[PDB]
Amino acid sequence: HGVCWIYYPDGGSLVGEVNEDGEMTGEKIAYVYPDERTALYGKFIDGEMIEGKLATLMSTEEGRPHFELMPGNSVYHFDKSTSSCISTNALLPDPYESERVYVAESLISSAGEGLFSKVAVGPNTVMSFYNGVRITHQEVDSRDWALNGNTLSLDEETVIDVPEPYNHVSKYCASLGHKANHSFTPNCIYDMFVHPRFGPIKCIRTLRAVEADEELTVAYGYDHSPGPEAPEWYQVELKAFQATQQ
């Protein structure tokens, strides 16, 4: 038996010996994060993580990954959010994100907390995941902007939200993408991501090299000509940005 790797567009992959039907099912299947090193290894059924133990990919021989399990008993499973449940383990952090970002006071004035890089990385690096409950565009668009600070469009049917009180890390730290502040001159973008625990979500990906302890920012991308459909702080911010443009 040889091994198969199946990559997602975001660079993560499932890897293992497939079964009679070409399915990722068995006790020695892994999800490998985009760093091609951090992995969740163990029991999968048709590509869904049943019990993934944190591991490090130490080498690949004839295409077969050779892992070492990390100490501890960090286990993860597929746990997609619903309309009302953000996570079965809200305080269990993502182990890839934990090595790449931390939350601190923003450097942007009056912006509360922000998301910062722990280490220097290159362009095109996935830094953080934006998981949340999954609600409709109808609910979100029909309600006040004060409730919509953490809403992220996922696709034409779903918006991801991190509603109070899960916007505080003492209550929810499984993912941290909702902590990145806005910039009209950002160093990251939101990008599609298929996560073995969260399912189909978005991630924060660098668009250039970033230094250790640099604040990560993304363009929130509100509609500027539906004036702008956006919160006050952003509209005020948009004026200024437009000012600098000539």
């Binding site: 979100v140 929130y220 539906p226």
Partner: peptide, 8 residues
Amino acid sequence: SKSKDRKY
């Protein structure tokens, strides 16, 4: 439209 990153 009251969410980030839509494809207008």
